Amino acid sequence: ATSGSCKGRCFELQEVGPPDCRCDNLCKSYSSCCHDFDELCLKTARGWECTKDRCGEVRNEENACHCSEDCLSRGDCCTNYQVVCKGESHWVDDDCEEIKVPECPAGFVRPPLIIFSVDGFRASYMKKGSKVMPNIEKLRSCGTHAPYMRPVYPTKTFPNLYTLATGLYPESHGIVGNSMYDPVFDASFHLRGREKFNHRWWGGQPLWITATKQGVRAGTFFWSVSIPHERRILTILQWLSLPDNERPSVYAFYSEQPDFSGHKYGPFGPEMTNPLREIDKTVGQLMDGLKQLRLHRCVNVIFVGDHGMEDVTCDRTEFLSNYLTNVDDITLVPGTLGRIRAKSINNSKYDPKTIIAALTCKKPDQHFKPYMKQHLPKRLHYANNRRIEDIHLLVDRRWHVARKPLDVYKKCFFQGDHGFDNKVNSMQTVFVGYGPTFKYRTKVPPFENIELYNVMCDLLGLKPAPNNGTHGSLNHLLRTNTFRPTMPDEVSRPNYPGIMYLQSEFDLGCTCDDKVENKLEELNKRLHTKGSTKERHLLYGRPAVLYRTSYDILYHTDFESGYSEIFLMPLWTSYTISKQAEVSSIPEHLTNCVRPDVRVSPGFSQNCLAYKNDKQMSYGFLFPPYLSSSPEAKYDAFLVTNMVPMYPAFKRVWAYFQRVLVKKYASERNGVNVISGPIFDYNYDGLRDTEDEIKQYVEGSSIPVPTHYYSIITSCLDFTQPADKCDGPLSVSSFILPHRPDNDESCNSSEDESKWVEELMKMHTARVRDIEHLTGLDFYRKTSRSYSEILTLKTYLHTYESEI
Numbered sequence: 001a002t003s004g005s006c007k008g009r010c011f012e013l014q015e016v017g018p019p020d021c022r023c024d025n026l027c028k029s030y031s032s033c034c035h036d037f038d039e040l041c042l043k044t045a046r047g048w049e050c051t052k053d054r055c056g057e058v059r060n061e062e063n064a065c066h067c068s069e070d071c072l073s074r075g076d077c078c079t080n081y082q083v084v085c086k087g088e089s090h091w092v093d094d095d096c097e098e099i100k101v102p103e104c105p106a107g108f109v110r111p112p113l114i115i116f117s118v119d120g121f122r123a124s125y126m127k128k129g130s131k132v133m134p135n136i137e138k139l140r141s142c143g144t145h146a147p148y149m150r151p152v153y154p155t156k157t158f159p160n161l162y163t164l165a166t167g168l169y170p171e172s173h174g175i176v177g178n179s180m181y182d183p184v185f186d187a188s189f190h191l192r193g194r195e196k197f198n199h200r201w202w203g204g205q206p207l208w209i210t211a212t213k214q215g216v217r218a219g220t221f222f223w224s225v226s227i228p229h230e231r232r233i234l235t236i237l238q239w240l241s242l243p244d245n246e247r248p249s250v251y252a253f254y255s256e257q258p259d260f261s262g263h264k265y266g267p268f269g270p271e272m273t274n275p276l277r278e279i280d281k282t283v284g285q286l287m288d289g290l291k292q293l294r295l296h297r298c299v300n301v302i303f304v305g306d307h308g309m310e311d312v313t314c315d316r317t318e319f320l321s322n323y324l325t326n327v328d329d330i331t332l333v334p335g336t337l338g339r340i341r342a343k344s345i346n347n348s349k350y351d352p353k354t355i356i357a358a359l360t361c362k363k364p365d366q367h368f369k370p371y372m373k374q375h376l377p378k379r380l381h382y383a384n385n386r387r388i389e390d391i392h393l394l395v396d397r398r399w400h401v402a403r404k405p406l407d408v409y410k411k412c413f414f415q416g417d418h419g420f421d422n423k424v425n426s427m428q429t430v431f432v433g434y435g436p437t438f439k440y441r442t443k444v445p446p447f448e449n450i451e452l453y454n455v456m457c458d459l460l461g462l463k464p465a466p467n468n469g470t471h472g473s474l475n476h477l478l479r480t481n482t483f484r485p486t487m488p489d490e491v492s493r494p495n496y497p498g499i500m501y502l503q504s505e506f507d508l509g510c511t512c513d514d515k516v517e518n519k520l521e522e523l524n525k526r527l528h529t530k531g532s533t534k535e536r537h538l539l540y541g542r543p544a545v546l547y548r549t550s551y552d553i554l555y556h557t558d559f560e561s562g563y564s565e566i567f568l569m570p571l572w573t574s575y576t577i578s579k580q581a582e583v584s585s586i587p588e589h590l591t592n593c594v595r596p597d598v599r600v601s602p603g604f605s606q607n608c609l610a611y612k613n614d615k616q617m618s619y620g621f622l623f624p625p626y627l628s629s630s631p632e633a634k635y636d637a638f639l640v641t642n643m644v645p646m647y648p649a650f651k652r653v654w655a656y657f658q659r660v661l662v663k664k665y666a667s668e669r670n671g672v673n674v675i676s677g678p679i680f681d682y683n684y685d686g687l688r689d690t691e692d693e694i695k696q697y698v699e700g701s702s703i704p705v706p707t708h709y710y711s712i713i714t715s716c717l718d719f720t721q722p723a724d725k726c727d728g729p730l731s732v733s734s735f736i737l738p739h740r741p742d743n744d745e746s747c748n749s750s751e752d753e754s755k756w757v758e759e760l761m762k763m764h765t766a767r768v769r770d771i772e773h774l775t776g777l778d779f780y781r782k783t784s785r786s787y788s789e790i791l792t793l794k795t796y797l798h799t800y801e802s803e804i
Ligand SMILES: *[C@@H]1O[C@H](CO)[C@@H](O[C@@H]2O[C@H](CO)[C@@H](O[C@@H]3O[C@H](CO[C@H]4O[C@H](CO)[C@@H](O)[C@H](O[C@H]5O[C@H](CO)[C@@H](O)[C@H](O)[C@@H]5O[C@H]5O[C@H](CO)[C@@H](O)[C@H](O)[C@@H]5O)[C@@H]4O)[C@@H](O)[C@H](O[C@H]4O[C@H](CO)[C@@H](O)[C@H](O)[C@@H]4O[C@H]4O[C@H](CO)[C@@H](O)[C@H](O)[C@@H]4O)[C@@H]3O)[C@H](O)[C@H]2NC(C)=O)[C@H](O)[C@H]1NC(C)=O
Pocket: 168, 169, 171, 172, 173, 174, 200, 201, 202, 203, 204, 381, 384, 385, 386, 466, 467, 468, 685, 686, 687, 773
């Protein structure tokens, strides 16, 4: 029962043992507050602002906040008190002055952190709404800011806030949507309802728990809906005046705006100016309140959004009923994404394959694309959770998907929505960091919100729980408190084999027209096989292998590789193509040439016979024959140790990349270095498969079939310098292409490769870091750049969007 009292307990920080009634922030959410909660803890009398007449008033405990002489000591002045009653200036009116050191009251052990979060705050509001947000604009221009921050997918509220709290992808923390079904719980999670409150949904370790476990106290992060914003601000300010042994060090504020209005009015509806005004005034209240408590040059403030907002209306809805016949046999999680599962598990007459086929390229202008979850772009990291349905629909920006038209009129309401692919410009959101530990007047490049958890932990002197950020990749945001990152140690050292086998030892079923045999160039041919050109084709040192395996370094005139004796193919193949380089064809007589490698045993080689016998699987080459430096060097490209298994449908993509695109990138970027290789992720967890996890081999062999192929393409950021002679910062783009036996993903694939290939590759853009997880390799080990800068480079994603 709720029979006790909140007198002296308002917004208490510890949760009281039930059923003793509660006075903490969550009580309202559980219907468990004491009977006098509203009266005592949610006072509203006289508003939130001191006025001239209230100054020096006789304290009255009924007031929402206070203008009496004792209010600073009691910690409960209205935020504008010192301005009205003491002739002080608003914080926004003060010039900004660099904060070189924390300027905190006696008893403060560390600068507090306040996370000020705003729902639906699209990145471009910073520029487009600048005239109406003077407090936010001062934070932004005086502190450290990014032009935008990339959310996680789906670009919904709980998945993104819980990613901020934990540093984890939604697939790992478990909050994979604003709505979800868990098939093991046989339970559904919604925005409505009490289900979302069960701790069984929320995995990982959020910042507040990380803090508590290491002796740093945390304010509440979840604010009950009914508590107004002025009262949240005042609660944080009151907690900040607690005695040293009770005062938290980490605080959060949350606003439902501008998202709430953005849904109704669209992202730039005229109605949107006022919510931006109101958020700014709330920021003003906090800064004035901090400055009153002499904390405005002590506290680190993060102003951060969860996602942006796109124009979306009822009439831009695709209906599954217009594609399927058995539309009543499915359940759809609708909207700016789609997730489909059977309406009943006691129905084995349910075929995902027929459903996908019925949804693929059916209408010329189709505004979604179906995927099995394991085939989604690896950059989304959206598969490894039982709450993610096998069938996913990626919806075009500005559109919705729904099951049947009745779901739209029997559920126009709205003009804005969010949830799309996280590379979409309209879904980008904001980051500003302001305070003694952040830099002064500094712009940093856009980065992903998965990285912030490590930085908040550094800000608080905490050791972060295991997470998906790359610790040190955001060191450049901070004045001090930088983590000191170090390269992981190489686990496996390579072998450097010489010529050990005679041709006749091999029985691989391979042939080649190669017997058309001079000490000027015979000394040189041995030179190249020993590593003379290795400084040209391996520019950043050899990748380190971070797991236990057996592998060989193989040198060639045009390329170097790391050849795995366990997977029977290279883990990486590295080569440099200069701006000047020539493309040539595979000579007629060498169309089907494959040559045994005299450095590598028959027993650790692939064989041509398995490919002949496997009617589905063909093969390609990692270093492409088309880019050989001479007719003589081209023979190296046909070594058995350069070959990888490729479906004919995939060879269309691969050959166009190698024959056309590598050269175009070299021309555009003043040379490129390329590192290519296979990826095996049969259990779709984003991590390198062990040999015993492989589910497909080339028929009747031990040759494993990659699920994906990658390339990392590096050049000089200053493109006046050639890739191979670059003195400064690097520039990288990468991809992870799915290795698929059809091109059903590309609706225009029946046309020439020049109309569809590059579009596919763009969709499958990747971070170097994503490739490192998938390979157990560590790249860029020998450069002249600092390790923190290299970590930033490894987290870079080339998105192919236009400028914000
Ligand atoms: C992003 O960062 C995160 C965090 O670093 C990375 O995720 C980690 O990956 C690790 C390797 O996969 C994984 O390690 C495993 O942990 C098992 C213990 O699991 C529990 O305890 C931990 C620690 O407290 C906890 O965090 C886990 O939380 C998960 O599960 C709960 C529900 O139970 C959820 O609330 C929560 O959201 C989270 O779910 C996510 O992860 C699980 C997998 O753990 C997925 O299934 C979910 O879908 C979801 O994504 C757990 O509460 C431990 O038992 C494992 O050890 C077995 O396997 C290893 C290696 O394969 C082997 O060496 C061991 O000997 C052992 O094998 C034996 O057990 C097998 C399984 O029962 C059995 O089949 C064998 O026969 C053997 O007998 C393993 O070490 C770690 O838990 C997660 N952590 C998180 C939070 O996700 C993530 O990889 C990064 N992503 C990228 C792309 O880099």
